[model samples]
Target: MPGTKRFQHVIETPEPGKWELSGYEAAVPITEKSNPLTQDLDKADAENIVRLLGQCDAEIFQEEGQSTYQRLYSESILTTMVQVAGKVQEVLKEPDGGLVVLSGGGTSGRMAFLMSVSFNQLMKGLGQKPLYTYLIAGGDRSVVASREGTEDSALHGIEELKKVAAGKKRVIVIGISVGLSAPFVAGQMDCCMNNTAVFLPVLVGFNPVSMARNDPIEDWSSTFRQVAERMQKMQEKQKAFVLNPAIGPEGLSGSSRMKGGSATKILLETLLLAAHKTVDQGIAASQRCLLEILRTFERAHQVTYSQSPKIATLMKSVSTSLEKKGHVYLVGWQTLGIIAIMDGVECIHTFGADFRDVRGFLIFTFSQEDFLTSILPSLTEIDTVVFIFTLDDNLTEVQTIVEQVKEKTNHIQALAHSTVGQTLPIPLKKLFPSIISITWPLLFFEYEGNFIQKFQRELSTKWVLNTVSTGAHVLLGKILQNHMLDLRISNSKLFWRALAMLQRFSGQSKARCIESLLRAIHFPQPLSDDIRAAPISCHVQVAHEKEQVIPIALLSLLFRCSITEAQAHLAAAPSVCEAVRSALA
Candidate 1:
C-alpha cells in the first residue's frame, strides 16, 4: 500500500484549507487555495460581485504583502521578466530560423494564442515574416471548446511540441499552466531538456517553485516540481527560465480563468511588447520601460474600475437574461471581435452554460453567420445585446445594426472606448439606455502607441466581460461559496480540486473521500479493483464523460447515504446549489 500513502497525502488533511499554517495545508499551492476575501462571494449582490472581482485583479499590481509568497512586483520577478524579454528580443531581431511558440492548456493556452496572434499581427503590420506559433493542448478547436483531458498526457505534449517545431533551427517554447500542474506541460519541458540544442524552455505560472505539484505525472517518471527544479538548475547559465509570481489566489476558489487568464495576458504582453520595441525601435529590454508598460495596464484597470457603477448595472441585465433562459449577444469589430469570441467560449467553459447562452459575432463580416444564428425573426426582450466597439471602428455600421436590432429588443448595451472627444453620433447614443463609454486620456508611450491602446482596450473589455459572465452565474447560484461546485472534473487538476472540496465539506478521512468519489463516479456499478487501480488519467477520462460527480460524491459523503440515495436527492432538487443547500439544511 505504498501508493496508498500518497493518496492520503492528496486528500487526508482533516480540514483541507481551514488553516493554512498547518504543515499539511501549507503544501497546497497558493493559486489553488481559498481566498479570505472571497469567502462570501456566493452570497454577494451583483454590484458587490463586480467590486470583489476588481479587488482580486487589482492584486496583480499590489507592491507586496506580508505573506511569504512572492508578489508580482518582487525584485526577483522583475529580473526574470528582464531576462525573458532579452530572449524574445533576440527572436524578434534575428528571425532567420527562430520561432516563439506560446503553448499551454485551457485558459493559459487561450492567452498563448491571443498573444501569438497579436505578435504576428505586429509582424504583418511591419511587413515582416510571422515568427510566432501557438499550441494549445488540443489544437485550435480547443480555443472555442473545453479540452481539459488533453492536458493529462505527456506523450501528447511531446508529439505536439515536436510537430510544431519541425525543422526549426532554434525554438523558444513558453509553457504556461497557471497552476503548474498540467502533465502536458511537464512532458513538453521534458522534451526540451532532452534536446536543448534546438529548444529553449521558459515556464510561466503563478505558484512558487516549492509549491509546484510534486505528485507523479501519469506515464512519466518526473513530477512537475522535479521538471521545474531541473530547469532552475539549468537557469544559471541562461539555458532556461521560470517566471512565477504569486498574485494571490483567484477571486473564485480554483477557477483560474479569471485572475490566471488576466495575469497571463498582462505578464506575457509586457515581455513580448518589450521585445517588439527592441526590434522596431532599437530599445533594449530594460526594467524602466517594462515598468512603464506595467503601469499602463494598472492605469487601464483603474480606468475600467472607475466605471464600476455602469459595469455593475450591466451585470444585472446580463444576469437577468441568463436567468430568463435568454442569450447575451456580443457584437464586436476587428480585434475586439476576436476578444468577444474568446470571452464567449470562456463563459461556456466557466459556467458550464449552453453555447447559445453567451454568444459573440463579428460586426463587419458577421452578417451571414449572425443572421443564421441570431434568430432575428424570433428575437425577444429577454436577450441582452452589447455593442463592443472603439472610436476607430465604423460608426455607420453600428447604427445600421442598432436600427435592425431595435426592431426586436431595445435591451441593448454599449462598452465603447475612445480618446478624448471622439464621440458617437446621436442615433447610436440615443439607442442604449445603458452604456459605458470610456474616453481614454491621450497618453504618450515611448513607442508602438497603437499596441498600447489596442491591448489596453482588449484587456479592459475582458475585465468587463469576465465580470458580467461570472457575476451572472454567481447570481444564478452555479457557484457554491467561492468554489465552482458544479465544475466538470475533466482533468487531474480539477479532480484534485474535487477531492479537496469533498474533504472540506464532509470533513471525512482521505480514504473515505476518495472512496466516495470513486463510488459516485462509478455509481450504480460495483467499484472494481481494476477501475480503482487505473491511473488518474484514465479515471478523469471516465470522469469527463460523466456529469455532477462532485455533487454526487459530496451528497453521499455528507449524509452517509448510498450513491443511489445521493443521486435521488439531486433529482429532487431544482438546481445544483439547492441540492447542496438541501443537504446542509
Candidate 2:
C-alpha cells in the first residue's frame, strides 16, 4: 500500500434524477505494484519465496508459505488490483461484454469471484438493468466449496477464467490475488491488459498487517509502521474529493463481507450506474453523487441498527439461552439467514469444543440452485442443516425450517427474505444492503464472552530433547521448573545449568553449598556424570523414580526459585545435594 491516490472522479452530482442511488461506490484504482513491493520483500527477507518458487523443491513448498509476510505480500495485490480495475474498466466500455464478474477458488480465489458478482449484481440492480455475470474460480463448483489442496496451483484459476472470458475483448476478469502462488493467473491478467482488455481486478486479505512471522531483512516494525503511515497520508490526499470514504462495516472485524464486500458492491454499482446515466440519459455523473450514496449508506446502517435492536438483542438472548441449553434453531434466507447461521457457528467456535456440543440446525429453504449450492450443507443436522426451497422461496423451504426448528427446540431464530408460515418482512436489503455489520457483531460478541475457553484450546501439554544444545535450549527446561518440558538441553552449558541451581533458593553462592550437593550425588562438578549416565545399553538410566529422581527436597529448592530464576542464577547452587536439599527444605 503506497500513498492513497486522489479521489477526483465524480460523474453524478446531487440533483433530481442526477442523484442516483446505486448501493455502490466508484472503483478505486492503483497505478503501480513494483519497486516498493519488491523493496518490501527484500526488507522482509521474503525475497527467498520468490527466488525459491521456480528452483526449490515443490514438496518443500507444500510446507512453506509466507504466512508472516502474508500481509505485506497481499497488500501489494490489493493496491495493484485497485489501480488495475479502474484502468481496465475505463478502457472496456467500447464493446460491452453484457456482464462482468470476478471468480476464483479457496479463500483467495473465491473472494475474488464473490466480490465481483456481488458488486456487479448490486450495480445492475440499482441502475435498473441486467449485467448478470460471474467470475467463478474452478468454474462455479468452487464457489461455496473449498478446493484448497490444489487451488493454490496458479493454473486452476487461469484455466477457469479463460473459458469464462470467451472471445470478449473486454471481459471482466476478477481474480482474488496476483501472487506467485497464482503466477499463471497474474500472467493472464497481464496478457489481457497488454491487449487493451478490461477487468474489475480484485484482491483480498490483510494489508501487510504483520511482520513477526518472517525473518526481517530490514527494521520490519519501521517498515510496516511506515507503510501504514504512508497509506494514511494517501487517505488525506484522497479525502480532498472523497465523498463516502468510510469503506463500510467490514472494518469492525475481518469478515470483509461486511465492509469489504459491501464497499466493493457499492463502489462497483456507483461507477456502473454513473457510466450508464452519462451514456444513456445524457447526464454527467459526478463524484458528489457517490459520496451522497455513501452518506445514505451510513444512515442506512444507523437506521438498520435502530430497527434491529430487537434482532441484536434477541441474537444476544438466543445466544446466551442456547449456551445454557446447548442448542439453537435457524429459519430464513439471504443475509439474515447467513447471520443467524453465523451466530450458531460462533457458539461452536467459542466453547473450545466441537460443533456437536453447540448443536445448531438450519432450515434454509430457498430452491435456487446457486443459493442452495453456494451456501448449504450437504447433510442434515450433522452440524448445521440448511434447506433450500425446492422452488424459489414460495416459502416451501421456510415451512420446512419452521417445522424443524419448532420440533427441535423451543427457542427459534428465523430469518426470511419472503413470507412462508409466520414470516416477518425484515426488509433486510432496505435496512442494510450488507449483512456483515449485523452478522459479524455476533461473532465478536461470542468471542469476547468466551475468551478464556477459546484461548485455552490453543495451549499444549506436550514436550523432545537431544544432547549438546545450549542457551535457548537450556533456558526451556529451567523455565518449566526443570521439567525438561519438551525439546532437550545438551552440552556442558546445560550440564552446568543443571548442577549449579541454588542462589535464589538456598541464599548461597555457586562454590559452597550448590557445588557440594552435586558431588555427593556423584553428579560431578558440571554434572558430567549425570549427562554421561543418562543412557544405558539402550534405555535411559535414572538414579531414582519420580519422587527420588532429583529428590523432593532438592526440587523444592529449585521450585522455590522458579526455573527462570535458577537458570539466571545457574552458577550458584550449593556443592552437596543434601546441603542444597536441606537448604531447600
Candidate 3:
C-alpha cells in the first residue's frame, strides 16, 4: 500500500486488454509462473521489495477475469467452501465418535496443524468436544524442521492416517498439497476414497485437478494426478471435494510456503468457522458468510502492508545483520510465538540460512530451554532482536526483556498489535528502539471473545514476518532472479528442483544437468557403474552431506570448470550472486 504506484514500474503491464500469460509463461503452472509484477524483485530495494511482494499477494484475491485461473472471490469457489462447511457441520452434528482429521506435507501440513488447533480451541471454548485432529508428515518434528523427504512416502502417510483415525466411526479427512503434488497427501486421499462409507475426503490445493502432479509415485500404483482425477469424479456424487481456485503464481517462483500456505490457512479457517457457527449459533453455512470471512482476510492483506515503510525498515535491519554474519532473533508469546518459530524455520529452509543466523524464542524461560542462553554471548551490535507481542500480553514482562536485550544490542525492533482504538502506554512503547504496530478495527470481532481474534492476529503476524524474512534475504542477494538459488537440497523434490535450476541457468540438457548435479553431489568419484546407477535417493542423501551442491554444480556446468575448481571458486566468492557473476565474466 505504501508504494502501489511505484510497484507498477516493476511489473510489465499487458497492452490494452490482454490478460493471459505471455509466450514464455505459457508452459508454467499458475503457481510457478514468474509474476510480471515482481520481475525485478532481486534488484529492488528493501522497501520496494516489500511493496512488490504486497502487490503479488494481492493477486490471491484477484476477481475472476478472462484469464485461465479462478481466484478467491469466484462464485463457484465460495459455493464449494459453503458446501464443504456443510459436510464438516454434518459430521460434527452426529458426534458419534467421529473425527475430523486434517493432513498434509510441508507448508500444507503446517497450516493443517495450525487450523486444526485453532478450530479445536474454538470448540473447547464453547464447551463442545474438540473433534478436530491433525496429521503432519514426519510428525511433530517436521512442524519445526524442513522434512520434505517424508512427503515422498505414500505408504507412511497411509499408516499415519490410519493410526490417528483408528477408533473413529467416521472421519472427514482433508489432505492438503498446495500443488496437488505430494504423494503423502495423495495416498491419504486415496485411502479415504477407498473407504467412503467411513471417510469423507476433501482435497485442498491451488492447481487444477488435471494439473495435479502426474509423475509416478515410487511404490504406489497410481500418481497424484491419477488419485486427484478419481476424486474429481467422486465430487459429482458429493463423495469427495477438491477446492483449488487457481490463485496465480507466487512472488518467489515455486515457493508454495508463501501464497499457497496463506490460501490453505484462509480456506480451511473459513470452512471450519462456518461449521462452528452452524453448530453453536444454529446459523447455516452460507456463501455470504464465507465471502465475508474471505473479505476480512483481503482487508488484512491491505492493513498489513499499510505499514510497508516500517516493515521495510525492519527488513533493512535484519538484512544488515545477515550481511554482517550476525544473528536475527524473533521473540514472542502464545500463538504469536509459534508463528515466529515457524517463520524462522521456513527462512532457514527457503534461504539455507543457519539456525543461529535466524532464530525464534518464547518470551519466557522454560526448563532445559537453552535457546537464549546459548546465543547470549554472541549478541552484538550486528545482531538484531525483534519483539512480537499483543496488547493482551504482559507489557511489564516485555519491557523487562527488551531492557535486557538493549544492553546487548541497540538494534531492536517490534511488531506489536492491539484491537482498534486500543493504545499502548508511553512507558511500554518506549521499550523498543523501533516498532511497527497495528490496531485492528472492532469489526473484525465476528466471533466476539473467540479464537477469531487469535487467528486474525496470527495471519497478520504471518504476513508481516514472511515479508521481513523474504525481503531481508532478497536484499542479502540470496535470491537470483526470484529463485532461492541457495536452497537446501535435502530431499528428492529439491534434488530434482536443483536439476531443473541447472538446466535453466546452464543451458544444458536434462541428461547433462543430471550428470553435473550427480558429479557435484558425489564429487571426486571415479566413473563407476554403481555410482551412476544408484537411485536418486542415494544422490539426494549424498547431496545433503554437502552445502550448496546445486550452486557448485551450476558453476561447473556454466563455467566449464571441474567440480573441484567450482568448489574453490565458491569458497573464494561465497555469495551465489557474486560467484555466478565472476564465473560468467
Candidate 4:
C-alpha cells in the first residue's frame, strides 16, 4: 500500500465479449476474445456511476510511487477516476477559496495524511492555491505507529471537526477506515453531512459473508465492535456493500493492514487520478471516478502485504512492557496535553474497568506558561513518561522538565521535532505544515489501548463495569461492582420470600425472619399483607435510607421511584431485599 508497493488490482472480469484484458494493463481493444471496457462491462451498470462522478471539471493524473500501479480490467475504458476527479475539480475550480479535509485513524489515517499533503503540494505547483485539510488520529506521530488512544472517542471526533470548522469554512470531508466506522470519523462525517456539506466516505475492509460462528458478536473487541456497528449503520442507508473480498479470516485477526491499508491507497489514487485527468482532458463522461477509486482501494489484497515489522515489533515491546508493569501514562506537552485528556476519558468510557483498574494518567508539562519551576515537582519514581514536543518548544523549560523526569524514572522518553539526546524525533512538519486535529486523538487512543489490554483482570473489570451500568440505570450508579446490596420488596410473595430468606440465612423461622425485618424498620405489623412487594411500586426516593424507613414510608418509597419501575412493580412486593442477597454473590 505504501507508494504502490503492493498489487491489489484484480485483472480478470466475468464478462467474455465485453472488456478485454489485452495487455499487462488492460487496453480497450475491439477484437476477438477482447473485452474493451469502453463497451460497458456487466454486473453493475458503469455508465450511471460515471455520470455521477464525471460531473466535475478538473484535470486528473495518476500516482505511480515506488512501484507501478497494477493494471486491472478497465471498466468504462476511462474508469471511475474521472467522475470522482470531476466532482473534486468542481469544488476546487471555484475561486471563492474552499478547502477539502481528509482524516482517518491508524493506517487509514496515515493514508489520509499523505493524500492531503501530497494534493496540496500538487495544487501549489500549478500556481493554484486550494485549501486542503489533513486529520490523523493521535497526531502525525501515528503515521509511523498506530496511536489508537483517541480513535474510539466520538467526542474527540466531534471536537476535531469543530476546530476545523471555526474559520466558517466550507469543507468537503473524506474519511478513511477499513470499515468506514471510525467513531470520531463517523461523527465528523455526520457533522459535515448534517451541515449540508459533502462527505465522501471510503471504507476499506474484507467483505465477509457471515461472521456468525467463526466470528461471533462477542469475538469483536469493544472498540472494534462500536466502530464496525457505526460503519454498518452509516453505510446502510447509502446502499453500500456489506462484504469484503478477503478470502479468509484477517491475517492478524482484526488487523486491517492487509486489505484496509491497501484499500485506502487505491481509493485515494483513483481520486487523485480522476482529478488529474479531469483537469487535463476536460470534464466528460468518459472518465469513471467512483468505480476507479473503489476498485483501486480494494485491490491492495493481491500484493504480498508486507508492513515493516519493526514498528509492530516496537509496539509488541510496548505491550510487553505494559504487561510487566501494568498500565501506561501518556504524558504529552502543550496541545498534546489536551490529547492526553481526551484519550484518558475515552479509555475509561470504552474499556470500562480495564481502563479504571489500570493507572494511566495524562500529564502535561507545558500546560501553563511557566518554565523552570513547572518541571521540578511533577516526576515520580515509578513513572514512565513519553514526552512530545515541537522544535518551537521552550528549550529551557523542556530541558528542566526532562531532567526532573529522568531523575525519578529511567523510562523517560521523548518524541520531538529533532532526534536529540534520548529523544525520538519524527519531523512530521516536513510532511505538512500544521498537523490536523483529527489525527491527534486517534494516535493516543491506539498506543494506550494496546498497552492497557495486556492485563486480563484489568480488562475484565472494564467489561463488568460496562454491563453493570447498563442495568443499574442511575440509582445504583455509585453502588456497582457487587457491593452495597440492599432493597425492600412489597406483596405477600415477596414479603414471605424475604422472611423465609432471612430465616434460611439466619437459621430463623418464617415468623422470626419477619420479626427481624419488622424490627429493622420498627414496623407496627410484620404480616405479609401489611408490607409492599418490590420497592419500585412503592416509589422509593434517595432519602429513604435504612433507618428512615418505617411501615408508613414503605409505600412512599416505591411511589417516588422512577415511573418506569413503578409501573412494572406496582402490585408486586415493593421490597427487593431477597434480590440484594442473591445479586451480590
lDDT for each of the candidates?
Answer: 0.82, 0.31, 0.79, 0.37
Greater TM-score among 1 and 3 belongs to: 1
Question: So what's the TM-score on candidate 2?
Answer: 0.41
TM-scores of all predicted structures: 0.95, 0.41, 0.92, 0.35
**CA lDDT of 45 in candidate 4?**
24
lDDT of 2 by residue, 59-144 (tens): 11112144223211133323333443343334334535544545433334434443454444544545534443554445555444
Question: In model 4, which range of ten residues has the least summed lDDT?
Answer: 52-61
Which tens-of-lDDT digit does each residue in 3-103 have in candidate 3? Answer: 23212212232333332443333544566667777778889998789998888888888888874666678877887788889888887888778899898
Q: How far is each candidate from the true structure, as Cα RMSD in Å?
A: 2.2, 21.4, 6.9, 21.6
Model 3 TM: 0.92
Candidate 4: residue 307 lDDT (0-100): 18
Number of the top candidate by lDDT? Answer: 1
Report the number of backbone clashes for model 2. Answer: 53
Candidate 3 off by > 4 Å? 1-24, 364-378, 444-448, 526-533, 571-575
Tens digit of per-residue lDDT, candidate 4, span 433-539: 22211111111112212221111111112222111221111121212121111223322212322333333233323333333454344334332432333231122
lDDT of 1 by residue, 456-514 (tens): 99899989988888888898888888888777778888888888888877778877888
Which residue pairs collide, candidate 3? none
Candidate ranking under TM-score, highest first, comes to: 1, 3, 2, 4
